[PDB]
mmCIF file of C-alpha atoms in Angstrom:
data_model
loop_
_atom_site.group_PDB
_atom_site.id
_atom_site.type_symbol
_atom_site.label_atom_id
_atom_site.label_comp_id
_atom_site.label_asym_id
_atom_site.label_seq_id
_atom_site.Cartn_x
_atom_site.Cartn_y
_atom_site.Cartn_z
ATOM 1 C CA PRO A 1 26.910 142.868 81.362
ATOM 2 C CA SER A 2 29.000 139.985 82.679
ATOM 3 C CA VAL A 3 32.376 139.734 84.402
ATOM 4 C CA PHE A 4 34.727 136.891 85.297
ATOM 5 C CA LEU A 5 36.509 138.084 88.444
ATOM 6 C CA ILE A 6 39.742 136.508 89.673
ATOM 7 C CA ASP A 7 41.678 137.341 92.831
ATOM 8 C CA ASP A 8 43.467 135.419 95.571
ATOM 9 C CA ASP A 9 42.338 137.838 98.300
ATOM 10 C CA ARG A 10 38.983 136.401 99.394
ATOM 11 C CA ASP A 11 37.854 139.619 101.097
ATOM 12 C CA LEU A 12 38.874 141.906 98.233
ATOM 13 C CA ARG A 13 37.194 139.598 95.735
ATOM 14 C CA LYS A 14 33.926 139.692 97.673
ATOM 15 C CA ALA A 15 34.029 143.484 97.953
ATOM 16 C CA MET A 16 34.764 143.751 94.231
ATOM 17 C CA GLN A 17 31.953 141.341 93.366
ATOM 18 C CA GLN A 18 29.437 143.276 95.468
ATOM 19 C CA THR A 19 30.495 146.579 93.913
ATOM 20 C CA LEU A 20 30.171 145.208 90.380
ATOM 21 C CA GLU A 21 26.819 143.550 91.091
ATOM 22 C CA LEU A 22 25.428 146.775 92.563
ATOM 23 C CA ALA A 23 26.653 148.467 89.382
ATOM 24 C CA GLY A 24 24.522 146.065 87.359
ATOM 25 C CA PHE A 25 27.052 143.386 86.407
ATOM 26 C CA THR A 26 26.497 139.638 86.595
ATOM 27 C CA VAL A 27 29.646 138.348 88.294
ATOM 28 C CA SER A 28 31.345 134.952 88.347
ATOM 29 C CA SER A 29 34.148 135.028 90.919
ATOM 30 C CA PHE A 30 37.096 132.637 91.009
ATOM 31 C CA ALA A 31 40.017 131.976 93.337
ATOM 32 C CA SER A 32 41.962 130.442 90.441
ATOM 33 C CA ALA A 33 42.757 131.746 86.963
ATOM 34 C CA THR A 34 42.722 128.176 85.675
ATOM 35 C CA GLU A 35 39.104 127.639 86.701
ATOM 36 C CA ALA A 36 38.095 130.971 85.167
ATOM 37 C CA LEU A 37 39.834 130.250 81.860
ATOM 38 C CA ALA A 38 37.910 126.985 81.582
ATOM 39 C CA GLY A 39 34.689 128.954 81.154
ATOM 40 C CA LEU A 40 36.034 131.413 78.590
ATOM 41 C CA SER A 41 35.695 131.308 74.804
ATOM 42 C CA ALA A 42 35.522 133.715 71.864
ATOM 43 C CA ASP A 43 31.751 133.637 72.420
ATOM 44 C CA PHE A 44 31.996 135.084 75.938
ATOM 45 C CA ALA A 45 30.035 138.356 75.928
ATOM 46 C CA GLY A 46 31.654 139.777 79.044
ATOM 47 C CA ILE A 47 35.001 140.929 80.377
ATOM 48 C CA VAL A 48 37.702 139.545 82.642
ATOM 49 C CA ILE A 49 39.118 141.290 85.712
ATOM 50 C CA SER A 50 42.105 139.520 87.235
ATOM 51 C CA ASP A 51 44.763 140.239 89.797
ATOM 52 C CA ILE A 52 48.170 140.247 88.116
ATOM 53 C CA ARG A 53 49.561 138.010 90.869
ATOM 54 C CA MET A 54 48.116 134.620 91.820
ATOM 55 C CA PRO A 55 49.748 131.671 93.646
ATOM 56 C CA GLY A 56 49.107 129.433 90.639
ATOM 57 C CA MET A 57 48.510 130.665 87.085
ATOM 58 C CA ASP A 58 49.279 134.386 87.389
ATOM 59 C CA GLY A 59 47.390 137.241 85.753
ATOM 60 C CA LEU A 60 49.735 137.662 82.803
ATOM 61 C CA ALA A 61 49.665 133.941 82.091
ATOM 62 C CA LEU A 62 45.864 134.135 81.990
ATOM 63 C CA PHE A 63 46.137 137.221 79.795
ATOM 64 C CA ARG A 64 48.294 135.427 77.227
ATOM 65 C CA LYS A 65 45.802 132.540 77.181
ATOM 66 C CA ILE A 66 42.901 134.939 76.620
ATOM 67 C CA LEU A 67 44.818 136.795 73.910
ATOM 68 C CA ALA A 68 45.072 133.497 72.019
ATOM 69 C CA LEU A 69 41.353 132.736 72.417
ATOM 70 C CA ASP A 70 40.150 136.185 71.368
ATOM 71 C CA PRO A 71 42.275 139.360 71.446
ATOM 72 C CA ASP A 72 39.066 141.379 71.671
ATOM 73 C CA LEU A 73 37.901 139.782 74.922
ATOM 74 C CA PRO A 74 38.933 142.595 77.355
ATOM 75 C CA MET A 75 41.177 141.809 80.329
ATOM 76 C CA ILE A 76 41.582 144.349 83.136
ATOM 77 C CA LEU A 77 44.516 143.672 85.445
ATOM 78 C CA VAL A 78 44.287 144.502 89.155
ATOM 79 C CA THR A 79 47.752 145.387 90.435
ATOM 80 C CA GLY A 80 49.682 146.625 93.440
ATOM 81 C CA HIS A 81 51.772 149.766 92.942
ATOM 82 C CA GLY A 82 54.957 147.725 92.617
ATOM 83 C CA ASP A 83 53.729 145.831 89.561
ATOM 84 C CA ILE A 84 52.288 148.781 87.636
ATOM 85 C CA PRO A 85 55.199 148.751 85.138
ATOM 86 C CA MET A 86 54.370 145.114 84.342
ATOM 87 C CA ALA A 87 50.696 146.023 83.876
ATOM 88 C CA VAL A 88 51.615 148.907 81.577
ATOM 89 C CA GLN A 89 53.696 146.556 79.454
ATOM 90 C CA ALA A 90 50.776 144.105 79.403
ATOM 91 C CA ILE A 91 48.524 146.844 78.009
ATOM 92 C CA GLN A 92 51.110 147.546 75.305
ATOM 93 C CA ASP A 93 50.932 143.789 74.653
ATOM 94 C CA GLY A 94 47.145 143.777 74.279
ATOM 95 C CA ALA A 95 45.643 143.900 77.777
ATOM 96 C CA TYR A 96 42.715 146.322 78.051
ATOM 97 C CA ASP A 97 43.558 148.379 81.135
ATOM 98 C CA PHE A 98 44.684 148.077 84.731
ATOM 99 C CA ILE A 99 43.450 149.241 88.111
ATOM 100 C CA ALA A 100 45.903 149.912 90.941
ATOM 101 C CA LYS A 101 45.252 148.809 94.523
ATOM 102 C CA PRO A 102 43.974 150.382 96.637
ATOM 103 C CA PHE A 103 41.128 151.574 94.425
ATOM 104 C CA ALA A 104 37.714 153.121 95.009
ATOM 105 C CA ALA A 105 34.538 151.213 94.164
ATOM 106 C CA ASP A 106 33.326 153.811 91.661
ATOM 107 C CA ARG A 107 36.698 153.651 89.865
ATOM 108 C CA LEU A 108 36.495 149.872 89.515
ATOM 109 C CA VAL A 109 33.064 150.456 88.012
ATOM 110 C CA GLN A 110 34.203 153.025 85.452
ATOM 111 C CA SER A 111 37.043 150.782 84.314
ATOM 112 C CA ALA A 112 34.754 147.761 83.989
ATOM 113 C CA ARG A 113 32.151 149.787 82.117
ATOM 114 C CA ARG A 114 34.657 150.918 79.482
ATOM 115 C CA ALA A 115 35.753 147.307 78.959
ATOM 116 C CA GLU A 116 32.162 146.046 78.794
ATOM 117 C CA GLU A 117 31.461 148.754 76.221
ATOM 118 C CA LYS A 118 34.290 147.533 74.001
ATOM 119 C CA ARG A 119 33.086 143.941 74.255
ATOM 120 C CA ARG A 120 29.475 144.948 73.566
ATOM 121 C CA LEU A 121 30.547 146.845 70.444
ATOM 122 C CA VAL A 122 32.747 143.972 69.262
ATOM 123 C CA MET A 123 29.953 141.423 69.672
ATOM 124 C CA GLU A 124 27.476 143.759 67.953
ATOM 125 C CA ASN A 125 29.938 144.199 65.083
ATOM 126 C CA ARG A 126 30.313 140.436 64.714
ATOM 127 C CA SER A 127 26.550 139.945 64.884
ATOM 128 C CA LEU A 128 26.035 142.505 62.120
ATOM 129 C CA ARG A 129 28.680 140.907 59.902
ATOM 130 C CA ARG A 130 27.117 137.480 60.452
ATOM 131 C CA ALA A 131 23.754 138.858 59.338
ATOM 132 C CA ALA A 132 25.250 140.512 56.253
ATOM 133 C CA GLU A 133 26.922 137.281 55.148
ATOM 134 C CA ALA A 134 23.775 135.289 55.916
ATOM 135 C CA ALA A 135 21.738 137.660 53.749
ATOM 136 C CA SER A 136 24.376 137.679 51.018
ATOM 137 C CA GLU A 137 24.457 133.870 50.900
ATOM 138 C CA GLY A 138 20.679 133.595 50.800
ATOM 139 C CA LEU A 139 20.553 135.936 47.817
ATOM 140 C CA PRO B 1 43.400 157.670 63.933
ATOM 141 C CA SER B 2 42.666 161.341 64.568
ATOM 142 C CA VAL B 3 42.639 163.538 67.666
ATOM 143 C CA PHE B 4 41.454 167.058 68.450
ATOM 144 C CA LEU B 5 43.781 168.252 71.217
ATOM 145 C CA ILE B 6 42.946 171.221 73.440
ATOM 146 C CA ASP B 7 45.095 172.761 76.163
ATOM 147 C CA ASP B 8 46.014 176.256 77.322
ATOM 148 C CA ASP B 9 49.610 175.270 78.143
ATOM 149 C CA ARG B 10 51.430 175.816 74.841
ATOM 150 C CA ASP B 11 54.432 173.686 75.833
ATOM 151 C CA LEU B 12 52.371 170.794 77.199
ATOM 152 C CA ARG B 13 50.170 170.848 74.110
ATOM 153 C CA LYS B 14 53.190 170.609 71.814
ATOM 154 C CA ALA B 15 54.676 167.740 73.822
ATOM 155 C CA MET B 16 51.320 165.951 73.771
ATOM 156 C CA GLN B 17 50.931 166.502 70.029
ATOM 157 C CA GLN B 18 54.406 165.123 69.307
ATOM 158 C CA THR B 19 53.781 162.072 71.485
ATOM 159 C CA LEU B 20 50.464 161.328 69.778
ATOM 160 C CA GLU B 21 51.885 161.864 66.288
ATOM 161 C CA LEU B 22 54.802 159.525 67.013
ATOM 162 C CA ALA B 23 52.186 157.026 68.191
ATOM 163 C CA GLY B 24 50.540 157.234 64.778
ATOM 164 C CA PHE B 25 47.778 159.778 65.394
ATOM 165 C CA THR B 26 46.889 162.687 63.128
ATOM 166 C CA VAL B 27 46.582 165.628 65.520
ATOM 167 C CA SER B 28 44.767 168.956 65.301
ATOM 168 C CA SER B 29 45.806 171.113 68.258
ATOM 169 C CA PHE B 30 43.848 174.078 69.594
ATOM 170 C CA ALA B 31 44.381 176.746 72.238
ATOM 171 C CA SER B 32 40.609 177.219 72.504
ATOM 172 C CA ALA B 33 37.788 174.738 73.066
ATOM 173 C CA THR B 34 35.498 176.957 71.007
ATOM 174 C CA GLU B 35 37.677 176.658 67.910
ATOM 175 C CA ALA B 36 37.935 172.890 68.362
ATOM 176 C CA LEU B 37 34.178 172.438 68.764
ATOM 177 C CA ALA B 38 33.626 174.265 65.478
ATOM 178 C CA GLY B 39 35.267 171.379 63.631
ATOM 179 C CA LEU B 40 33.384 168.607 65.421
ATOM 180 C CA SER B 41 30.292 166.718 64.267
ATOM 181 C CA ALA B 42 28.701 163.287 64.668
ATOM 182 C CA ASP B 43 30.703 162.337 61.566
ATOM 183 C CA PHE B 44 34.065 162.986 63.240
ATOM 184 C CA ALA B 45 35.983 159.688 63.188
ATOM 185 C CA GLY B 46 38.429 160.628 65.923
ATOM 186 C CA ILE B 47 38.562 161.499 69.602
ATOM 187 C CA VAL B 48 38.887 164.640 71.692
ATOM 188 C CA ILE B 49 41.488 165.229 74.404
ATOM 189 C CA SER B 50 40.936 168.413 76.387
ATOM 190 C CA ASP B 51 42.245 170.000 79.536
ATOM 191 C CA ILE B 52 39.420 170.329 82.055
ATOM 192 C CA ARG B 53 40.407 173.948 82.725
ATOM 193 C CA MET B 54 40.653 176.641 80.047
ATOM 194 C CA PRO B 55 40.515 180.459 80.371
ATOM 195 C CA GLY B 56 37.478 180.559 78.084
ATOM 196 C CA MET B 57 35.144 177.625 77.419
ATOM 197 C CA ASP B 58 36.350 175.052 79.959
ATOM 198 C CA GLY B 59 36.723 171.315 79.412
ATOM 199 C CA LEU B 60 33.407 170.330 80.963
ATOM 200 C CA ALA B 61 31.566 172.941 78.925
ATOM 201 C CA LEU B 62 33.118 171.441 75.789
ATOM 202 C CA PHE B 63 32.204 167.983 77.061
ATOM 203 C CA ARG B 64 28.532 168.896 77.448
ATOM 204 C CA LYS B 65 28.540 170.340 73.917
ATOM 205 C CA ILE B 66 30.083 167.152 72.525
ATOM 206 C CA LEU B 67 27.635 164.987 74.469
ATOM 207 C CA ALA B 68 24.809 166.791 72.659
ATOM 208 C CA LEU B 69 26.423 166.330 69.231
ATOM 209 C CA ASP B 70 27.211 162.639 69.681
ATOM 210 C CA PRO B 71 27.479 160.855 73.049
ATOM 211 C CA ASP B 72 29.685 158.252 71.379
ATOM 212 C CA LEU B 73 32.367 160.731 70.312
ATOM 213 C CA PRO B 74 34.953 160.021 73.088
ATOM 214 C CA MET B 75 36.268 162.874 75.238
ATOM 215 C CA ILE B 76 39.337 162.352 77.430
ATOM 216 C CA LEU B 77 39.843 165.028 80.073
ATOM 217 C CA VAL B 78 43.353 166.104 81.086
ATOM 218 C CA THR B 79 43.303 167.202 84.723
ATOM 219 C CA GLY B 80 45.463 168.341 87.607
ATOM 220 C CA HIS B 81 45.249 166.290 90.805
ATOM 221 C CA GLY B 82 42.963 168.852 92.423
ATOM 222 C CA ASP B 83 40.245 168.454 89.798
ATOM 223 C CA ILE B 84 40.220 164.652 89.614
ATOM 224 C CA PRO B 85 36.897 164.443 91.519
ATOM 225 C CA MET B 86 35.328 166.687 88.864
ATOM 226 C CA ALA B 87 36.764 164.478 86.107
ATOM 227 C CA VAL B 88 35.426 161.350 87.802
ATOM 228 C CA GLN B 89 31.971 162.903 87.948
ATOM 229 C CA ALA B 90 32.300 163.850 84.270
ATOM 230 C CA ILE B 91 32.987 160.201 83.411
ATOM 231 C CA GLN B 92 29.875 159.193 85.357
ATOM 232 C CA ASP B 93 28.118 161.826 83.223
ATOM 233 C CA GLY B 94 29.363 160.362 79.939
ATOM 234 C CA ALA B 95 32.979 161.468 79.484
ATOM 235 C CA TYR B 96 35.247 158.661 78.259
ATOM 236 C CA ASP B 97 38.203 158.812 80.645
ATOM 237 C CA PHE B 98 40.672 161.201 82.222
ATOM 238 C CA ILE B 99 44.432 161.505 82.480
ATOM 239 C CA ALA B 100 46.037 163.191 85.490
ATOM 240 C CA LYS B 101 48.954 165.611 85.171
ATOM 241 C CA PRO B 102 51.803 164.951 85.319
ATOM 242 C CA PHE B 103 51.519 161.940 83.024
ATOM 243 C CA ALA B 104 53.950 159.823 81.026
ATOM 244 C CA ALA B 105 53.900 159.856 77.226
ATOM 245 C CA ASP B 106 53.173 156.131 76.938
ATOM 246 C CA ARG B 107 50.207 156.527 79.320
ATOM 247 C CA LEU B 108 48.708 159.318 77.219
ATOM 248 C CA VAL B 109 49.057 156.943 74.285
ATOM 249 C CA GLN B 110 47.300 154.015 75.955
ATOM 250 C CA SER B 111 44.400 156.224 77.007
ATOM 251 C CA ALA B 112 44.043 157.708 73.523
ATOM 252 C CA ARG B 113 44.229 154.277 71.915
ATOM 253 C CA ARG B 114 41.353 152.932 74.018
ATOM 254 C CA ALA B 115 39.228 155.944 73.059
ATOM 255 C CA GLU B 116 40.143 155.651 69.373
ATOM 256 C CA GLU B 117 39.183 151.979 69.555
ATOM 257 C CA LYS B 118 35.723 152.833 70.867
ATOM 258 C CA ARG B 119 35.211 155.427 68.143
ATOM 259 C CA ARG B 120 36.466 153.052 65.439
ATOM 260 C CA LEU B 121 34.033 150.364 66.603
ATOM 261 C CA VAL B 122 31.146 152.839 66.796
ATOM 262 C CA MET B 123 31.779 154.132 63.275
ATOM 263 C CA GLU B 124 32.148 150.571 61.959
ATOM 264 C CA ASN B 125 28.857 149.649 63.635
ATOM 265 C CA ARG B 126 27.108 152.614 62.027
ATOM 266 C CA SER B 127 28.640 151.809 58.645
ATOM 267 C CA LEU B 128 27.391 148.225 58.870
ATOM 268 C CA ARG B 129 23.880 149.319 59.842
ATOM 269 C CA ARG B 130 23.823 151.805 56.959
ATOM 270 C CA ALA B 131 24.743 149.008 54.555
ATOM 271 C CA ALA B 132 22.083 146.678 55.965
ATOM 272 C CA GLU B 133 19.358 149.296 55.554
ATOM 273 C CA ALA B 134 20.628 150.199 52.085
ATOM 274 C CA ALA B 135 20.449 146.540 51.061
ATOM 275 C CA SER B 136 17.058 146.085 52.710
ATOM 276 C CA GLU B 137 15.627 149.108 50.884
ATOM 277 C CA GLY B 138 17.011 147.994 47.537
ATOM 278 C CA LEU B 139 15.342 144.609 47.937
#
């Protein structure tokens, strides 16, 4: 499983990366949503975990960009208590889930695992449909 | 989307059922986990939402029974603050997610929708594999 992790808090990002890696995830951490987005595509087999607030492109801006690329590429928003209402609205808008700070390591893991599961199922579904069409065309 | 809803609190169960129905779910509500389990099978296309505590078969007992029937049939546990640690352990054990009481209607909806999404993808995956094998055998 893979994760693109974005947060402006250097220390929090490192703690989050270590937790995810020890949980079996391959993590790519970024200090900027823009840099992270550059590596994303509808072919990305992982998930995105981003703070809702960033000094540059914020978390919701990144979310909208991801939604356009592939609505089934899960985005988990990391948020402070004050912004929870915004995160809840984002979920209604298509975001996968949110995790409120401060959060426990095992909780970050359970949230990421649910998102990875959705992405794994979506990619498996697409792979199966590709095979069906490939077989159908051959015949 | 369908949901098997189990809770001992008659009033809470009715409020939950109304919220889910207004969110587009077809709901079957039960006052006993035993009665609910009787209608479940690996063919069930919906999800289960159960209180972790019940005077008879409790929520974790129902969870273990469901896990045996089909680990991919999502179970969401409804829990009081005091039992959250037990719910977290249940998730580590295979449960889908948990919702803490008191909870807002829109939050119950977002949790149920994520679970329904997993089940929908799982059933679609199985349907596709069935078709592939059916085609392969015919040829």
